[PDB]
Amino acid sequence: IIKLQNLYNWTPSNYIGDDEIENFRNGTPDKLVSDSLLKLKRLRKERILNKVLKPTTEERELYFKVKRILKEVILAKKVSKVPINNVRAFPVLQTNYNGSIPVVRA
Amino acid sequence: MGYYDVLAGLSALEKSSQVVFSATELQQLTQKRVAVHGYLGGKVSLADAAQVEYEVGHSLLGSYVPRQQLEALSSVDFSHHFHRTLECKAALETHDVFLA
Amino acid sequence: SARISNRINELERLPANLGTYSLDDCLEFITKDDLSSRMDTFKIKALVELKSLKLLTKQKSIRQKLINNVASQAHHNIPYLRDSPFTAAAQRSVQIR
Amino acid sequence: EITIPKPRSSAQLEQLLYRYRAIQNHPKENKLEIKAIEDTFRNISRDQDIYETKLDTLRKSIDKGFQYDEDLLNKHLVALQLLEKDTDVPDYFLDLP
Amino acid sequence: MEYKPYKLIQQIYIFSSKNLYSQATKPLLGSRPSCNQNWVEYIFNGNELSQNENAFSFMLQPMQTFLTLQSHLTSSLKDTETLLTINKEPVKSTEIFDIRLSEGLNHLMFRCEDKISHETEFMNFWINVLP
Amino acid sequence: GEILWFRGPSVIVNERIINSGDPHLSLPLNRWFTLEPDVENEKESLPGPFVLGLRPSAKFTAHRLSM
């Protein structure tokens, strides 16, 4: 059956796999993260060598997996300190008005 | 082109309920280098350059706009132009296909 | 060339009104009429990168001019090349009347 | 069959829901898009429940006293950022760690 | 200066043309619909304004060329009203006029006269139609 | 010291920066939670245009002032 509680609350990064559960229970998730980053870099190199722009689905999945692993590591307070280096600005749109002096149009 | 593209188009316009797909519509919606310039070497004949096809593509106003013309353009018209060509193109393509 | 064209495409598809909130505007008590002294910092960087990417061939041409005009005078400006017996012998052989 | 594909992102799911909400009041006429939309919704809700259960099992069986080294975490953060925004990670940045 | 609220004029409306709206929402089974679709409306109350500050300014997008002006009068007697565009004279069809502005800067002088008590009231409108 | 006269009346802009993401500005698709015009129309009287613009909290300004 369908639950609106689930349709409203869903993202493409909601596909935990058994590898994560194992590499958490058995400790050392960092090995999984490093191997996944290496795989991402290799896939991107192969994506560059032949001219193609859109990343494949497996690249998106590896990215989502790495983000989830790091998120659950930081949330569980399993790190002593978190590095905080952020650009202390961020881009934002800006109102755009026209000039009021009319054109001569020779 | 794509099913979700068709849905996004039909939803951009508010005439999404005035469309009905058939069986076939659904089943089909789910699926050398000639030296042009001479800034670095000895230029080839201009005829040879004309024989080749140019395609910049990435730029918006082409690869060249004269100084006076660009300096004396209108920004509102070009903003509307870019809004029509870059962002609202899928909705207009769907309106060309469906909606008579 | 494909990578460069892709980057230029992405840069040109940016909006013109691209202000930046700098988080240090707190000390500048802006009163909705003043102008923030840092609204154009990401716009300036975007313009710089775009124009530098569009002036690549000009830099290449000037670089190759410099390189050619500094190589042609190797045997006259570099000591350990000018002082070898073979370069001296060749430069003498050219000037034989 | 028809088998409307899985939505790539959340905006696609939102537009699926919008299309369904538009179609609802003509079931005898549409009668085919509704079933595919509902099968997709069933798959999505099933995946959401499975994800919730797996997350609950994960957070309660992490480890007793394991910790993440700061150097490796910093390198991983920087590499993730770079790869996320289409830049390049030098070759000596991940093999050596 | 001083403060002189209006007595004859009351609630002047200047809004976008109904024909532009109908042609932008219904394409007459022909072309494509527009993409901007910005429709405005400007209301001015007779009272709580001043007869010594009777000018108003605003800008319009290039597609907002056709406007319509609707006037209401507190003086339920017979009065004389004249609308002046850039110094031509439009004719009405409570009164309703349809105006077709021109690119640049346009000047609308709306004038009412009582002719019984012989009181005059003016309203000036400067409008910018961008290129 | 003489008055400069321009051919066009000036321009007033309330906010210089806008909230590109906002339920007031960017109306979301598929509104989830809440003859005659309609029953579902709702009006909201904002306390000022500053709701549409970016402003820092007083707490962060005080924090920066403390140093």
Added chain:
Amino acid sequence: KLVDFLVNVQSILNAASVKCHVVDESFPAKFFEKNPDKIYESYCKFIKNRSNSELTTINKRFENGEYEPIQGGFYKLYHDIKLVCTILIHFYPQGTRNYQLVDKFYKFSSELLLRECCRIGIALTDDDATELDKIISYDFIKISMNYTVPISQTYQIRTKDMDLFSSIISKSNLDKRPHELPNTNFKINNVLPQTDIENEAPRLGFVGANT
């Protein structure tokens, strides 16, 4: 919250008045009303009485603990700010430096107090006539958003050739002095703010074209 809020507000107002000294100005310190939109008027009355029957700053009211975290204290702060600003605006000349400094400070402080009070759940305090409205209300459902904002003014003249306008007048919205036309034949034009919010803009490649 409210305690730290008052502390932060005091620090901010002290920091923002280095050039204006608005916080270091002394008003009668026994005046108070309920509706702010009449304050100046009432003050005038007050003056007259105490002018014919012939004390503290804002920092002094802060250190003496005069603003309570209840709505009363916030309204007292807003009232005192508006009062001192009106006083110093009517004191200084029309367009001098301190005039515009006081105006800028008033804008800043008022907006700050309003936003902050609205963030803590506190407050400090129709389309039938046109056929366009009729057809719009018939075709679309309207999700509305209402706000108010004062309009500005400028001078306008007519000559042999063309109509000419002045710069925007920097007269504050607290200035109650009636007016003073510097010359006759000067018309007063009312400039209306800009309507659009998501007004589009061209891409970056349009302003960074190759020439």
Added chain:
Amino acid sequence: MFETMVANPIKVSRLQSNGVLTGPAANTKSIH
């Protein structure tokens, strides 16, 4: 009134608009 007056517009050359260099060392034909 004001109907008989003329504008006397303000003209600014682009050279004057961007690239004026000043000081006693403005012109080169100066001992300073």
Added chain:
Amino acid sequence: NVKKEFPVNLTIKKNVYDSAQDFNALQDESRNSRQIHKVYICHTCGNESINVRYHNLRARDTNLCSRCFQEGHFGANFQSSDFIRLKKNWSDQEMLLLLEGIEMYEDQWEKIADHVGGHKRVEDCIEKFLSLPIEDNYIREVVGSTLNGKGG
């Protein structure tokens, strides 16, 4: 008798894999079907002010496409009662508050989530922090440190 690199303007570029996380200024209002605008603005120049009335428009002709979700809309195939009887994307004010919270409270995520507002959970703040662009000087320092550690 060091290699200075071209700046990595990370704040300008866009996310390649999930482009639903870019700043709202960089996103394209075309995936949520918000390109075409239907606005109606009513002014009122009454008393030295203006009561701007902004109206967004949605087609009243569309049945069950511009109306709030309710229980009577979904049939027996749904379990929406409790959910309907009882945010999801970020904004610019919320992004600013997140930056300020990180600036004040370094890693105390609960104080940060309280500073942002009752809408965001701690997990969302951690996600957004993970996706924020980092400085360029720090990137140069890290990459150069790795390079010098390899070469020496």
Added chain:
Amino acid sequence: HKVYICHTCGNESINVRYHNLRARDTNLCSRCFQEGHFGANFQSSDFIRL
């Protein structure tokens, strides 16, 4: 030093100028930029603060 002059009013711009990204020769005062005193074919996004 160097002196810049607003393209609309003869007054010289002080401490800051608004360079036109299309004209590339005409700079504006801060005030003439705040009030939109440039041409009616230019938008505020065509200028940059220097």
Added chain:
Amino acid sequence: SLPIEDNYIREVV
């Protein structure tokens, strides 16, 4: 001396 093209040359090679 402007590293305009270095990133792409480096990532391709």
